[PDB]
Paper text:
The biocatalytic reduction of the oxime moiety to the corresponding amine group has only recently been found to be a promiscuous activity of ene-reductases transforming α-oximo β-keto esters. By studying the crystal structures of enzyme oxime complexes, analyzing molecular dynamics simulations, and investigating biocatalytic cascades and possible intermediates, we obtained evidence that the reaction proceeds via an imine intermediate and not via the hydroxylamine intermediate. To gain more insight into the reaction pathway, we determined the crystal structures of the two enzymes OPR3 and XenA in complex with the oxime substrates 1a–c, either by co-crystallization or by soaking. All the crystal structures obtained had a high resolution (1.9–1.35 Å) and showed clear electron density features for the oximes.
To assess if the introduced amino acid exchanges affected the overall structure and the binding of the oxime, we also crystallized the tyrosine variants in complex with selected oxime substrates. The protomers in the crystal structures of the tyrosine variants are perfectly superimposable with the ones of the wild-type enzymes, confirming that the exchanges did not lead to major structural alterations. Interestingly, the binding mode of the oxime substrates also did not change in most of the structures. The propanoyl moiety of oxime 1b points into this cavity and is likely stabilized by hydrophobic interactions. Substrates with an acetyl moiety (such as oximes 1a and 1c) give the non-productive binding mode described above. Tyrosine 183, the canonical proton donor of XenA,55 is also found at a hydrogen bond distance from the Cα of the oxime. Looking at the results obtained for XenA, product formation was comparable for both tyrosine variants, the canonical Y183F and the non-canonical one (Y27F). The calculated high Kd for oxime 1b clearly indicates this enzyme’s low affinity for the substrate and might explain why this enzyme performed poorly in the biotransformation of the other oximes in our previous work. Both the Y183F and the Y27F variants of XenA showed a non-Michaelis–Menten behavior, with a linear increase of the rate over the concentration (bottom right).
Author numbering:
A (entry chain B), B (entry chain A): 2 to 363
Write the structure that this text describes.
């Protein structure tokens, strides 16, 4: 089965094509991860996935989505990830991390605590920053402060320092969070970027923050470890053909700038959209980005059955299949997929203390 | 659903009727558990089971099954369990432990490393002890040393010391391992016990080691925490009616000795048997023990589907359903069962960072 073929990118070899995409846990305190994350990540890595990308980890305190978000804005924050890196590697998986800045969608409650912007009377909140002083709307009404040129320099340096820390902590795969309506995506989109300086207006200017951040990270991230990004390539806002064409052109520039793989997603920049949710619906879009930009890709949002994942690889729509929620339901989902796809010795997707007995359960 | 009704025994309340029975991991070193066990147990506890009984933990070095078995024969060994106890509790499950002595089945290889008695030239092996100098046979040919009265006194004290260490580590539930052909079971069975002293021959004599060990443990284990045992009530050796009658009588004497619940199993004392493996095959046997000995029971060996578990509880065959291998396959099996049985808010079997999203997946 294609899902269980290894994948090599730079010096990193994944044992199969199953990637666990970044999934915020909202369980950190002051950015510091803890026993929640340690067990959560170690268990999923033992489940068999070849790559585990750690959740959106803020490059700066105001770049957290919520008060429960992980951070990597100090060396002490980075050192807290070391046992997670070690547990993922000990399980035979590859440890990655998504480094992030939530932009105008920051200072929000946890999803099971309202999911909305923290009110001004709640001392847990903080001022948000963005390309322009314009709110997302809906449940995120807080108007962000428009970034200064010094803010732009500072946030870029925060991404550099976050990448340096991720490198030194032993991560073997990095993903820049340029998707999902957060800071990077909001620089690209004309919905959110009304700037009149070098960072807004034209395609070159809207791309500039993302390309400059990529280039700055490229200087500190090892050439032999995959340098990746997540990017929303369309919004389902009635502008899809033009937006996809521009996003694919930006992907070409990412490739020229040393990007090794693109996690293809939806922008989620504004709420006034009509996303056609369905099984594997991103398949054709990821395939178009992969083929037209000539870059390996992953995607998510409905590939979480063994046959859907296998079909996407066979059709050369994806290079890795990201499977998120199914791994929250079952940390050993990779083993479940190996069984369903008839992999020889499927139980040995898991470590010996499980595999021995489940082979004989069979 | 009966499977998701709470259960109270002494001062302990389990949130549902799903118990994870003891399952050796073979990953300890010199009896000390480590990060294998920490993640393994914490992840299963977060999966939703109401009770998690930690694997057979040796009361003495020679009572391990294998060089990978956990031990609790010193205070340092007990302290290693504290983070496991606390992680199970933090997940909302109840931490138990099975304390054990492998008897003539000790000094064996891990199951995926031959599963057989360690060879005499292998430096990892040790001298085994048993009621009588008689080998199990088959893949376990080593002849054990017949225990003296001094050995009997010492092993009993080892069980006492282990129970006191388990108490201080914070376990809320203890299970004495009198099953599966190990030391306790082998004192009961005429196949393995040929003694001519007070500990062999008659039913009273064969029961004596088990009753005296239970009574000695009772003096140090808190009256307000469940005191349980696992015991093989038949062998499938052509002597089932007589053996089950004797085993049920011993269960009555365990109850008179303060036992709160019996984990009903098969003896596995000798290899020359014909065990009729099948779904829920222990149901009728556990029901007979429960009704005739008037004692709460659990059992295992084929209850690991949601409907089989539910049916056994509704028929009053069991008070708790032990589900072992299904939790190695999926450490969130309790959530899978809640979904299959149509429990309201089934996703909230899991902690919020999973439950919130799986409710909406639905
Ligand atoms: C709990 C949760 C947290 C998420 N956090 C992140 C995140 O930190 N970064 C990110 O890029 N996507 C995040 N996402 C989106 C997922 O990576 C993924 O795209 C989504 O779950 C769809 O894939 P699936 O259908 O396999 O679940 C998150 C999704 C969930 C359910
Ligand atoms: C890996 C493994 C380890 C086990 N270790 C123990 C043990 O330490 N003590 C015990 O009493 N039973 C042990 N058993 C037997 C189980 O507790 C249980 O009775 C068996 O797995 C049957 O239940 P199931 O059909 O739900 O798996 C073990 C079983 C397995 C698969
Ligand atoms: C068998 C492979 O798994 C392991 O050894 C492990 N984590 O995966 C540890 C720390 O014991
Ligand atoms: C809905 C698009 O945004 C995401 O997927 C996300 N992070 O990227 C979270 C934490 O929800
Ligand atoms: C029929 C069950 O066989 C097993 O796997 C087992 N436990 O589950 C053993 C041998 O310990
Ligand atoms: C909200 C549930 O969180 C937990 O269960 C936990 N351990 O289990 C923590 C706080 O780390
Ligand atoms: C075959 C019966 O033995 C067991 O289940 C056991 N412990 O009790 C193991 C395999 O470790
Ligand atoms: C509640 C819907 O869950 C999702 O689709 C999701 N990821 O899978 C989000 C919003 O991040």
């Amino acid at each position: 089965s294609a899902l269980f073929e290894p994948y090599t990118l730079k010096d990193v070899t994944l044992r199969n094509r199953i990637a666990i995409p970044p999934m915020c846990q909202y369980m950190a305190e002051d950015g510091l991860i803890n026993d929640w994350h340690q067990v959560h990540y170690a268990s999923m890595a033992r489940g068999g996935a070849g790559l585990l990308v750690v959740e959106a980890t803020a490059v700066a305190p105001e770049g957290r989505i919520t008060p429960g978000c992980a951070g990597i804005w100090s060396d002490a924050h980075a050192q807290a990830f070391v046992p997670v890196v070690q547990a993922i590697k000990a399980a035979g998986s590859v440890p990655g991390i998504q480094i992030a800045h939530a932009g105008r969608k920051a200072s929000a409650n946890r999803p099971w605590e309202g999911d909305d912007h923290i009110g001004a009377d709640d001392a847990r909140g903080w001022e948000t920053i963005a390309p322009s002083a314009i709110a997302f709307g809906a449940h995120l009404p807080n108007v962000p402060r428009a970034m200064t040129l010094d803010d732009i320099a500072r946030v870029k340096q925060d991404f550099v320092d976050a990448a340096r820390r991720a490198r030194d902590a032993g991560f073997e795969w990095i993903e820049l969070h340029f998707a999902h309506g957060f800071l990077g995506q909001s620089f690209f989109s004309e919905h959110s970027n009304k700037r009149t300086d070098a960072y807004g207006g034209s395609f070159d200017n809207r791309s500039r923050f993302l390309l400059e951040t990529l280039a700055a990270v490229r200087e500190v991230w090892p050439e032999n470890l995959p340098l990746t990004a997540r990017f929303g390539v369309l919004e389902y806002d009635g502008r899809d053909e033009q937006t996809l064409e521009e996003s694919i052109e930006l992907a070409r520039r990412f490739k020229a700038g040393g990007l090794d793989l693109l996690s293809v997603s939806v922008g989620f920049t504004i709420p006034e959209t009509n996303i056609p949710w369905g099984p594997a619906f991103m398949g054709p879009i990821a395939e178009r980005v992969r083929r037209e930009a000539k870059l390996p890709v992953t995607s998510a949002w409905g590939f979480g059955t063994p046959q859907l994942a296998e079909a996407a690889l066979q059709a050369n729509q994806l290079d890795l299949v990201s499977v998120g929620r199914a791994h929250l339901a079952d940390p050993h989902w990779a083993y479940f997929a190996a069984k369903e796809l008839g992999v020889e010795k499927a139980s040995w997707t898991l470590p010996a203390p499980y595999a021995h007995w489940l082979e004989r359960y069979r």
